[PDB]
mmCIF file of C-alpha atoms and ligand atoms in Angstrom:
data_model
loop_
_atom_site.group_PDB
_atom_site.id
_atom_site.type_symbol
_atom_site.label_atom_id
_atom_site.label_comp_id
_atom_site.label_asym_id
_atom_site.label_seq_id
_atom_site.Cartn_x
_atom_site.Cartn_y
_atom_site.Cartn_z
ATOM 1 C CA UNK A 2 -21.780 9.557 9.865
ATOM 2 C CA UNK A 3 -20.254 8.792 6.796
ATOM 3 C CA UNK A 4 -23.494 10.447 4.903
ATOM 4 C CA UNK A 5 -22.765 13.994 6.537
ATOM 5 C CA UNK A 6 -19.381 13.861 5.508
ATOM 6 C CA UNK A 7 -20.553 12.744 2.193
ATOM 7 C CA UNK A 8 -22.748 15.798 1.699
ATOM 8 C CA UNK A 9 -19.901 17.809 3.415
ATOM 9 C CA UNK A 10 -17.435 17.244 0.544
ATOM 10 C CA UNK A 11 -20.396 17.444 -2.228
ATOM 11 C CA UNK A 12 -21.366 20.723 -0.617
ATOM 12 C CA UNK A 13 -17.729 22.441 -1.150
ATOM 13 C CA UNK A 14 -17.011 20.387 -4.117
ATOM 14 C CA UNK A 15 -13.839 18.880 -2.621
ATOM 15 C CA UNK A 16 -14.343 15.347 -4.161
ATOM 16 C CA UNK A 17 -10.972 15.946 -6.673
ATOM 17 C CA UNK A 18 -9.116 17.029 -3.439
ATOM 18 C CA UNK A 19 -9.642 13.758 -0.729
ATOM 19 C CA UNK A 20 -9.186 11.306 -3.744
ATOM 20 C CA UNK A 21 -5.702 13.161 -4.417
ATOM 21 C CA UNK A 22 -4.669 13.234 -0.527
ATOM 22 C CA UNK A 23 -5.271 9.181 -0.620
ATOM 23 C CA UNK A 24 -3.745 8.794 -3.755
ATOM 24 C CA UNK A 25 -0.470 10.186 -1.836
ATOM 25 C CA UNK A 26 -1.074 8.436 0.914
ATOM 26 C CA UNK A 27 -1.499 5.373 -0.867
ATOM 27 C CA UNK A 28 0.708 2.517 -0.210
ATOM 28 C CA UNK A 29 3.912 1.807 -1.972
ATOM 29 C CA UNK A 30 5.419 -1.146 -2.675
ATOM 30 C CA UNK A 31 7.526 -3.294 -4.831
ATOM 31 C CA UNK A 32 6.489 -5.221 -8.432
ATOM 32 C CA UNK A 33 9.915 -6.603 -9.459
ATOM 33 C CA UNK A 34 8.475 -10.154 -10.402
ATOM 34 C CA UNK A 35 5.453 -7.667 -12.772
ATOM 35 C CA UNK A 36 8.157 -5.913 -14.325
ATOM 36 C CA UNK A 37 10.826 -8.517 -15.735
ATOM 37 C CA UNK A 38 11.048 -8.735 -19.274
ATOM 38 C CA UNK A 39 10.147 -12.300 -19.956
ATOM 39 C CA UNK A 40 6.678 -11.122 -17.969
ATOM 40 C CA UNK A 41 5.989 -8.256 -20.770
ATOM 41 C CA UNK A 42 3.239 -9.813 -22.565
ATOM 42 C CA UNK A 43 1.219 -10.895 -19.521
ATOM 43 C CA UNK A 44 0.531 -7.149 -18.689
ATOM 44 C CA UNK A 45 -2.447 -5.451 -20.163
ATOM 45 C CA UNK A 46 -1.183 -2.118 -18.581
ATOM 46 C CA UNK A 47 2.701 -0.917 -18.139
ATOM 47 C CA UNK A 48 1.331 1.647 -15.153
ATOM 48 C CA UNK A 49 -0.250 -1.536 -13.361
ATOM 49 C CA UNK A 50 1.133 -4.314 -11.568
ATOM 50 C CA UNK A 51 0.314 -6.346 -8.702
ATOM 51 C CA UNK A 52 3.059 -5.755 -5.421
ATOM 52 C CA UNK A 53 5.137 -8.806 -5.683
ATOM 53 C CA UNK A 54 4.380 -8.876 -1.513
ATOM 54 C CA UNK A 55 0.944 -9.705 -2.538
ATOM 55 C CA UNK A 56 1.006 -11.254 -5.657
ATOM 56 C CA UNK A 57 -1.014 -14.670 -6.635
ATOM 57 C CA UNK A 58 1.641 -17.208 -8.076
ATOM 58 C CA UNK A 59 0.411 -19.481 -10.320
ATOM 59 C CA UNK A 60 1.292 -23.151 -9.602
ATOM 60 C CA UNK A 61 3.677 -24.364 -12.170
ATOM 61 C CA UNK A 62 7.246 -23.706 -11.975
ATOM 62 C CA UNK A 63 7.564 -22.453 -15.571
ATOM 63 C CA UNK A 64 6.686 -18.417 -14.969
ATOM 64 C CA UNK A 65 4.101 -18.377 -12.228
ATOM 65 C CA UNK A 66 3.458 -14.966 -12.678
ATOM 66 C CA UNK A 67 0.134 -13.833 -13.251
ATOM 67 C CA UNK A 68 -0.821 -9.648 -12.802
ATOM 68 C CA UNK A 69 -3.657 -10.458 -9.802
ATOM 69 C CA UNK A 70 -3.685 -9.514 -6.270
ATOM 70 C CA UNK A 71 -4.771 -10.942 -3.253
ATOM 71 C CA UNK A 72 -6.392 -8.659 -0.978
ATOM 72 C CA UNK A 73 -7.237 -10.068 2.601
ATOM 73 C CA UNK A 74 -9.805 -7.387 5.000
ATOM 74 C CA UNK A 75 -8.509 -9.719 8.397
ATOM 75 C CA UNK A 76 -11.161 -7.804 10.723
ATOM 76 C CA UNK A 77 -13.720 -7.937 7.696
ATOM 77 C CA UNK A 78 -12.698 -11.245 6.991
ATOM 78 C CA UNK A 79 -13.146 -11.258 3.598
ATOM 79 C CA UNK A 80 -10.609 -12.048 1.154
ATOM 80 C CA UNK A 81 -10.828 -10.754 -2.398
ATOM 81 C CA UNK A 82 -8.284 -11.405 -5.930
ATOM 82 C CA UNK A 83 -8.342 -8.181 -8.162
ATOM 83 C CA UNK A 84 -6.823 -9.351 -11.513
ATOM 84 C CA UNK A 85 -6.441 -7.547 -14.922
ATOM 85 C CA UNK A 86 -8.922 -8.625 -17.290
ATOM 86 C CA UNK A 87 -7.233 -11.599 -19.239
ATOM 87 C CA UNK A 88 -4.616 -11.071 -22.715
ATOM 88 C CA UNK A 89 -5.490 -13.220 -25.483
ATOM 89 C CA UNK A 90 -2.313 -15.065 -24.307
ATOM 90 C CA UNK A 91 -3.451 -15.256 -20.409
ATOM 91 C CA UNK A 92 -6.407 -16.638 -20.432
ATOM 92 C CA UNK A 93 -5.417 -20.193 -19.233
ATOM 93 C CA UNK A 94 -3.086 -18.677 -16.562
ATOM 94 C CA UNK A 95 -6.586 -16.643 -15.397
ATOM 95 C CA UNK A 96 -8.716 -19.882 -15.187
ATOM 96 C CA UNK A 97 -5.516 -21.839 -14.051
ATOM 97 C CA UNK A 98 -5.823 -19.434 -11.356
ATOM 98 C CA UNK A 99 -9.380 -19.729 -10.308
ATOM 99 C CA UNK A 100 -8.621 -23.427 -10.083
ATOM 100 C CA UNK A 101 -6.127 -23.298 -7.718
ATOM 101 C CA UNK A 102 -7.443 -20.543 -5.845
ATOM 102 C CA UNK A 103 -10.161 -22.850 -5.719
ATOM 103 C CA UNK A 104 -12.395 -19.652 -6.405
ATOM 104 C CA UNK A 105 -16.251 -20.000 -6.662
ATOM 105 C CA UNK A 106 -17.362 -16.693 -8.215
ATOM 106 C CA UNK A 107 -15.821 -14.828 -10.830
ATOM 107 C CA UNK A 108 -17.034 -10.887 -11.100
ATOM 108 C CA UNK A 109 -17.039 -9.093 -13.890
ATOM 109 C CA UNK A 110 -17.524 -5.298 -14.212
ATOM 110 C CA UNK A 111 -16.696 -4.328 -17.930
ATOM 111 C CA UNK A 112 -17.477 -5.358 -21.532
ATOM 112 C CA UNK A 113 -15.368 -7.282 -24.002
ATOM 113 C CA UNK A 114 -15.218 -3.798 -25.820
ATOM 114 C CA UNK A 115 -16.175 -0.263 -24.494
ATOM 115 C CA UNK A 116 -15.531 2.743 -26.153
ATOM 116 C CA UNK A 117 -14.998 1.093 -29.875
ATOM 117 C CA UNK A 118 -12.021 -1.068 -28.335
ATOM 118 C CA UNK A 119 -10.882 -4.374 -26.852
ATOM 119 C CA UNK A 120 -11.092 -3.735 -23.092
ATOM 120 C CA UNK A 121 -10.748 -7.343 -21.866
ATOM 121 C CA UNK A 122 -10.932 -10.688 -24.151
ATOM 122 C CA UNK A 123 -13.394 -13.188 -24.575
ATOM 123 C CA UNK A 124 -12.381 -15.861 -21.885
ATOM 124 C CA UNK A 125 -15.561 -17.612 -21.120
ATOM 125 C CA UNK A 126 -17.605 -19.982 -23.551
ATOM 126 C CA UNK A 127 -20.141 -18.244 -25.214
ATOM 127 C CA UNK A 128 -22.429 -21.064 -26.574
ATOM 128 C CA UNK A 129 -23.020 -24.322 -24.748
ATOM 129 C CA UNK A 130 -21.992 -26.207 -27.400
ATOM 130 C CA UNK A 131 -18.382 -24.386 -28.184
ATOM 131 C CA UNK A 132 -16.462 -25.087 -24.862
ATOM 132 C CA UNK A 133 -13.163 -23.845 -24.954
ATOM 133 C CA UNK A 134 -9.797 -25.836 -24.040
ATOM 134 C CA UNK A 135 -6.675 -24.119 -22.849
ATOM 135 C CA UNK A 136 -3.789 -25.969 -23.823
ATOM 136 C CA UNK A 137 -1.162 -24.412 -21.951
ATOM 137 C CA UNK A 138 -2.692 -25.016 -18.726
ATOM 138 C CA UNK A 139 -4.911 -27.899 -19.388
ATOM 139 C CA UNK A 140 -8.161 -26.588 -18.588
ATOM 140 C CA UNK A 141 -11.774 -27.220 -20.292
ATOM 141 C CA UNK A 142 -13.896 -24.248 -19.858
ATOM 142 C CA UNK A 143 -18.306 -25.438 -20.515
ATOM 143 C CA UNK A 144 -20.816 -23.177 -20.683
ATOM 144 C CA UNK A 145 -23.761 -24.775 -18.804
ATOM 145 C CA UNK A 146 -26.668 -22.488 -18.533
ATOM 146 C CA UNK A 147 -26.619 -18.189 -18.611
ATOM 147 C CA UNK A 148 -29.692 -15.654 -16.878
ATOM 148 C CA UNK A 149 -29.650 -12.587 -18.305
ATOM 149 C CA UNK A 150 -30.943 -9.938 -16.936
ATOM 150 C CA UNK A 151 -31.616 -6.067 -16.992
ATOM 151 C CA UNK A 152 -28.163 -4.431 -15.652
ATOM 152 C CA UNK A 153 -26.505 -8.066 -15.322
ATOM 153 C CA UNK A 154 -25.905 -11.727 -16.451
ATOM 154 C CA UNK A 155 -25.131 -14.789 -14.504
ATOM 155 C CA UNK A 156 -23.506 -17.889 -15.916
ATOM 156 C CA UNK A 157 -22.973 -21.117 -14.862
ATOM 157 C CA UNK A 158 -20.100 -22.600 -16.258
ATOM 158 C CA UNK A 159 -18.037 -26.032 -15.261
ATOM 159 C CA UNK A 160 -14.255 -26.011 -15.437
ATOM 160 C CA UNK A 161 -12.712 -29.348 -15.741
ATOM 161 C CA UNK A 162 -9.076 -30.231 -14.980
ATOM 162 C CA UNK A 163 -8.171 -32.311 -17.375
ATOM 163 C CA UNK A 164 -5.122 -33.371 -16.058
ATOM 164 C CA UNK A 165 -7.234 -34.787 -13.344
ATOM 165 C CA UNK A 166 -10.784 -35.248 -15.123
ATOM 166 C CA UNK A 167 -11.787 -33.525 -11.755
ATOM 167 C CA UNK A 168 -14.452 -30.364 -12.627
ATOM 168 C CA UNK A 169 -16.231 -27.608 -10.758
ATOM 169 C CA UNK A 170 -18.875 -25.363 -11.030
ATOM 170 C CA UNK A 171 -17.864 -21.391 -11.587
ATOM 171 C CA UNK A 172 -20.915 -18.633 -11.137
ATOM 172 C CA UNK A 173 -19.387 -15.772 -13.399
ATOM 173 C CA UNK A 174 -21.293 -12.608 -12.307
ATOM 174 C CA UNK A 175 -20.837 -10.160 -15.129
ATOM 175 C CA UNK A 176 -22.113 -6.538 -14.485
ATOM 176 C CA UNK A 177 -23.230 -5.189 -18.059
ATOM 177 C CA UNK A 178 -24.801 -1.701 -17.683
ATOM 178 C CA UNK A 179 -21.467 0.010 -16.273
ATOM 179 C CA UNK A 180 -21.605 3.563 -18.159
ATOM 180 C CA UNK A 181 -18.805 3.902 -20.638
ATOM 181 C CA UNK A 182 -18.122 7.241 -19.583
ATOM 182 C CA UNK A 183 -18.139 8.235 -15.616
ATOM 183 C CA UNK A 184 -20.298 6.033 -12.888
ATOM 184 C CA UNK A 185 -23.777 4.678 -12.507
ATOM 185 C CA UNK A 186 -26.628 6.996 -12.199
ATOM 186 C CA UNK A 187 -27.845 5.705 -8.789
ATOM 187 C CA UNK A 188 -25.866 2.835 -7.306
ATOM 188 C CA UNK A 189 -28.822 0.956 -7.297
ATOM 189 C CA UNK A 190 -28.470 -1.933 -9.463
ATOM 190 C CA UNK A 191 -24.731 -1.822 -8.247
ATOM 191 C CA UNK A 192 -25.466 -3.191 -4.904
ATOM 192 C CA UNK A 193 -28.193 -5.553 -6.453
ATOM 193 C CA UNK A 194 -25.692 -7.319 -7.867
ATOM 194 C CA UNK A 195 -23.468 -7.105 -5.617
ATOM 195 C CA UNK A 196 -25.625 -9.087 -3.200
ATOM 196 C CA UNK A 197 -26.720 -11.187 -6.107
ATOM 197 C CA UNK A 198 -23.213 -12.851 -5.479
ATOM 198 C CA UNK A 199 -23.183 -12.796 -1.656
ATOM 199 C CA UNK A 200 -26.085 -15.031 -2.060
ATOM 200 C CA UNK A 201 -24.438 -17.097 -4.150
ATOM 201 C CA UNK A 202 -21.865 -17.852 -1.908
ATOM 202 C CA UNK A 203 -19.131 -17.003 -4.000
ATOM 203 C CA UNK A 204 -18.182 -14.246 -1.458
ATOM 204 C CA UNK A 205 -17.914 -17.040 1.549
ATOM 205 C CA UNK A 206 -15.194 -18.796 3.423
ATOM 206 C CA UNK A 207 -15.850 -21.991 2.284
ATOM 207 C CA UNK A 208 -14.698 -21.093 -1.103
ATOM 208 C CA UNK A 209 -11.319 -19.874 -2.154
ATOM 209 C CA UNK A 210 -11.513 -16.322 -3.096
ATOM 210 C CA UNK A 211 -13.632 -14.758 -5.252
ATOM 211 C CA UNK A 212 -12.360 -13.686 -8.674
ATOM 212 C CA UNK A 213 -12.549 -9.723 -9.566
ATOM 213 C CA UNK A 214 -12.260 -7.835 -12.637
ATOM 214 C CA UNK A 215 -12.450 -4.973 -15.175
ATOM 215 C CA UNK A 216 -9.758 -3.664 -17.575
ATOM 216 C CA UNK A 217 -6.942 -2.945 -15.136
ATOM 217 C CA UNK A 218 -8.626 -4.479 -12.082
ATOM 218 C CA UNK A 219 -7.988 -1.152 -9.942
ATOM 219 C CA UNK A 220 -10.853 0.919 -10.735
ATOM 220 C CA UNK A 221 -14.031 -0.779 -11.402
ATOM 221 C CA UNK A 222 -13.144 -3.600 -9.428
ATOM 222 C CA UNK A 223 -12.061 -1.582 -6.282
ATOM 223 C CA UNK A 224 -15.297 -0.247 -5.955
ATOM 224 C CA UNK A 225 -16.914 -3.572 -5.799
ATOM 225 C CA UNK A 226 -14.662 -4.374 -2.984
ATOM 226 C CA UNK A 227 -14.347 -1.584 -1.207
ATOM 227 C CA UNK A 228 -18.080 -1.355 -1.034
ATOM 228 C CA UNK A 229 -19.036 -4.822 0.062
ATOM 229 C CA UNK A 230 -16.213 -4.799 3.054
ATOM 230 C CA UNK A 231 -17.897 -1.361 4.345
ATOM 231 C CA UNK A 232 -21.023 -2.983 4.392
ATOM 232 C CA UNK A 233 -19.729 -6.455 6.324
ATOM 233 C CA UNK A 234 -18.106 -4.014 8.775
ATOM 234 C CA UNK A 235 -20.760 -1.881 9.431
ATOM 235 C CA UNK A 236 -22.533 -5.593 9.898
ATOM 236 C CA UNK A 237 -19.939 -6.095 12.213
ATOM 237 C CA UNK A 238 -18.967 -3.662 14.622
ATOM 238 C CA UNK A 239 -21.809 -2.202 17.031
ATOM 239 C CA UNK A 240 -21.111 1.644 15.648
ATOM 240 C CA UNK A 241 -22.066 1.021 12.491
ATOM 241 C CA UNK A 242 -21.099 4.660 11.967
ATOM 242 C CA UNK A 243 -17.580 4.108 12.539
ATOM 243 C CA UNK A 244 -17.229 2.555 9.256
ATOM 244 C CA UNK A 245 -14.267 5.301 7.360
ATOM 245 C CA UNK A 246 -14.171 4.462 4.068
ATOM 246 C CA UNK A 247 -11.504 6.139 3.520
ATOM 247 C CA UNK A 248 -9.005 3.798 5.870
ATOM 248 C CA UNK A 249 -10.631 0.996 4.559
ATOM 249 C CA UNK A 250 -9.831 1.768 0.999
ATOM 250 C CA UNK A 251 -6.215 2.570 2.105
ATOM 251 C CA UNK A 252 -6.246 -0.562 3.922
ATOM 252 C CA UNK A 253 -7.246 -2.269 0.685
ATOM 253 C CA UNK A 254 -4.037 -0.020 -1.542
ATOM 254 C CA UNK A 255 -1.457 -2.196 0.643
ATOM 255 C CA UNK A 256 -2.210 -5.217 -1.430
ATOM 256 C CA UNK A 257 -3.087 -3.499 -4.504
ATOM 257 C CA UNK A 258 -2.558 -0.494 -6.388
ATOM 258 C CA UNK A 259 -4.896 2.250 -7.543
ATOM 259 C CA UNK A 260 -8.348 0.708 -6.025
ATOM 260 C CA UNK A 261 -10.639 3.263 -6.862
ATOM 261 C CA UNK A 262 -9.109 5.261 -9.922
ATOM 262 C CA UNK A 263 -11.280 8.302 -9.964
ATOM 263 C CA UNK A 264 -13.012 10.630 -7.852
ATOM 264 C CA UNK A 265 -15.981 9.788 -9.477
ATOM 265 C CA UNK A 266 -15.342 6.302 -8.534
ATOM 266 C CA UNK A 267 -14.768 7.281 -4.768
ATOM 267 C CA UNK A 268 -18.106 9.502 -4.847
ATOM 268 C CA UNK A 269 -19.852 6.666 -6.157
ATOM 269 C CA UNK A 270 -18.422 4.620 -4.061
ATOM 270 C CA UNK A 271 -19.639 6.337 -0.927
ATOM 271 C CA UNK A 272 -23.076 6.507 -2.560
ATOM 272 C CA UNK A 273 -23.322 2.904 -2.568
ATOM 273 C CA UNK A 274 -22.493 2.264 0.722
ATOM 274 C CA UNK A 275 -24.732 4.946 2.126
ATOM 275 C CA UNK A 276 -27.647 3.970 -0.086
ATOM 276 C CA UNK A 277 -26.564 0.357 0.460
ATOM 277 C CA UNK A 278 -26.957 1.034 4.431
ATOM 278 C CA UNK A 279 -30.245 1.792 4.776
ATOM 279 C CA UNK A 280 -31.155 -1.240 3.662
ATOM 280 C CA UNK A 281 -28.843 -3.372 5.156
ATOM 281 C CA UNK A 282 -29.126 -2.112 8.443
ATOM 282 C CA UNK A 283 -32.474 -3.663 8.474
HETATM 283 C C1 901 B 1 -9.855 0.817 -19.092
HETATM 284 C C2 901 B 1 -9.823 1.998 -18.105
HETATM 285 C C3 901 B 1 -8.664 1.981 -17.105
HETATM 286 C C4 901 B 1 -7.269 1.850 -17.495
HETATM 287 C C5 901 B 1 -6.079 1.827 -16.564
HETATM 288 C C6 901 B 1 -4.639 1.745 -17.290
HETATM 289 C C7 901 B 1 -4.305 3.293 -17.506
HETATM 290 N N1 901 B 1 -3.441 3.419 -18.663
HETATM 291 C C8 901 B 1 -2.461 3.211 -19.551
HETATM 292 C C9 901 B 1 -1.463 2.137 -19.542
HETATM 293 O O1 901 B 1 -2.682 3.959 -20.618
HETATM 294 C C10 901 B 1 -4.124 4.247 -16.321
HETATM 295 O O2 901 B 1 -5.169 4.935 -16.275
HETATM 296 N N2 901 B 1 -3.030 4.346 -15.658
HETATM 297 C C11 901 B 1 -2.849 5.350 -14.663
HETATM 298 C C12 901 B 1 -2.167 4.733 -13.437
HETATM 299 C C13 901 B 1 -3.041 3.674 -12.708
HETATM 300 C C14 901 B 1 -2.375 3.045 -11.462
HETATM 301 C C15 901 B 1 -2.330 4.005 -10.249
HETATM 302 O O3 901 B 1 -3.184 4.646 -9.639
HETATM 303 N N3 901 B 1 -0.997 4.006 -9.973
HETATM 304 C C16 901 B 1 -0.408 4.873 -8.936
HETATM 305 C C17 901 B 1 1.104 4.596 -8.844
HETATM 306 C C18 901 B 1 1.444 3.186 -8.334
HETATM 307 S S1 901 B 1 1.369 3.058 -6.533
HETATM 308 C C19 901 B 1 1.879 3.847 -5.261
HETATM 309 C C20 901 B 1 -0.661 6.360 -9.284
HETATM 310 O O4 901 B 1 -1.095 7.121 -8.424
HETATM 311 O O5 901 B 1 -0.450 6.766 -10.403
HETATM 312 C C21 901 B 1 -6.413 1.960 -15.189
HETATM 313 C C22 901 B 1 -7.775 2.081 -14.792
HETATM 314 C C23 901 B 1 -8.908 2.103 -15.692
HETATM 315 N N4 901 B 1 -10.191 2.212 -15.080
HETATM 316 C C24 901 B 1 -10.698 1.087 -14.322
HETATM 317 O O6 901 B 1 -11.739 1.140 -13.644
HETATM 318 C C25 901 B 1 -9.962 -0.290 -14.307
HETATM 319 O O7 901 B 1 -10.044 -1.051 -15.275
HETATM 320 O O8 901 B 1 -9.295 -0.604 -13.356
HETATM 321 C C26 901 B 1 -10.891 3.447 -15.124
HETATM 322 C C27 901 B 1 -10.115 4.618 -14.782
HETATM 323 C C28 901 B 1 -10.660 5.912 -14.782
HETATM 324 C C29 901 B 1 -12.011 6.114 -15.108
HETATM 325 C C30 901 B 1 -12.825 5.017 -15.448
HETATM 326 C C31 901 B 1 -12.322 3.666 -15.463
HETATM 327 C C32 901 B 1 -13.355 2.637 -15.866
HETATM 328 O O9 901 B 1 -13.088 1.482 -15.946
HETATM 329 O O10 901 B 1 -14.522 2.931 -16.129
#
């Protein structure tokens, strides 16, 4: 019971201490392709890179680097890409990506700019009428329609390959009440939208996998993942119960780094799947 533990660790305030002992437990493994020079400028972060092991390599033998993960749950079976939220300069590598990843979702959990400063650029068309073109990658980027909402928007954009003329639709889920400072209140509107995109599909095996982000793509971003595999494996298995967060965020920190930055973030994430549970369960 994941819940008695939870209160366990509120009760002697010990929240600090488990996020440290999986923080050293943590997986650790090479970035060499992240750190070459010529790969500077496609970094938002110097302390984060994707493990070249699991790296997503952009399809163009030019530099196919590109600082995104792909993390793959095989008994959840449920594959995720946790990506830095695009430079100025990356933003045709990012939708270059989603193209070839054949991705249907994109999921956003951060603002343009937080705190008074640039936290991620504008890579999505803000007006129907002002698409955007990429050049170096050759991508048109439309905005089609956008529902916003109370803690969240949803946008339908079409990306077109204009190499090929070929275009798709893209649902870009964009969280917009994340706090600036510390986590949600109640995790509430959290797992709203979170199954706002299951039900989109975007989350599915018939689509290539779905597209997550914040600033560095560890944090924020973790705890959208990490929270919808514990909820598909407690779907799963018949002991729902047996669900450890814990291992499965550690089993998530072998294909990327940092998942989960805080132990805010891990409280928070625990209170999501919990709260998320009950109602889940049925
Ligand atoms: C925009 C906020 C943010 C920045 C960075 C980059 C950062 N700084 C630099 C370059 O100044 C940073 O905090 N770096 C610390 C190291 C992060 C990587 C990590 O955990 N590495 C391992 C080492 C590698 S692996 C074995 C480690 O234990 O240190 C990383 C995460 C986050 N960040 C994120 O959620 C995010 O965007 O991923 C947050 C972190 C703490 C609290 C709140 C948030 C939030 O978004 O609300």
């Amino acid at each position: 019971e994941m819940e008695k533990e939870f209160e366990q660790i509120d009760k002697s305030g010990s929240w600090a201490a488990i996020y440290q002992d999986i923080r050293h437990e943590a997986s650790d493994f090479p970035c060499r392709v992240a750190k070459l020079p010529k790969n500077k400028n496609r970094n938002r972060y110097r302390d984060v890179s994707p493990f070249d092991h699991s790296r997503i390599k952009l399809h163009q033998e030019d530099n196919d680097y590109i600082n995104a993960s792909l993390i793959k749950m095989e008994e959840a079976q449920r594959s995720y890409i946790l990506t830095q939220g695009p430079l100025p300069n990356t933003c045709g590598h990012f939708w270059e990506m989603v193209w070839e990843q054949k991705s249907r979702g994109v999921v956003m959990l951060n603002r343009v700019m937080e705190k008074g400063s640039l936290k991620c650029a504008q890579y999505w068309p803000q007006k129907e009428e002002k698409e955007m073109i990429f050049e170096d990658t050759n991508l048109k980027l439309t905005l089609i329609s956008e529902d916003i909402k109370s803690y969240y928007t949803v946008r339908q954009l079409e990306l077109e390959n204009l190499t090929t003329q070929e275009t798709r639709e893209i649902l870009h889920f964009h969280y917009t009440t994340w706090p600036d400072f510390g986590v949600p209140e109640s995790p509430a509107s959290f797992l709203n939208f979170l199954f706002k995109v299951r039900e989109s599909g975007s989350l599915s095996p018939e689509h290539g996998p779905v597209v997550v982000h914040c600033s560095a793509g560890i944090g924020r971003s973790g705890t959208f993942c990490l929270a919808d595999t514990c909820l598909l494996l407690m779907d799963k298995r018949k002991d729902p119960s047996s669900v450890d967060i814990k291992k499965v965020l550690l089993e998530m920190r072998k294909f990327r780094m940092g998942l989960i930055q805080t132990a805010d973030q891990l409280r928070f994430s625990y209170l999501a799947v919990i709260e998320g549970a009950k109602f889940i369960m049925g």
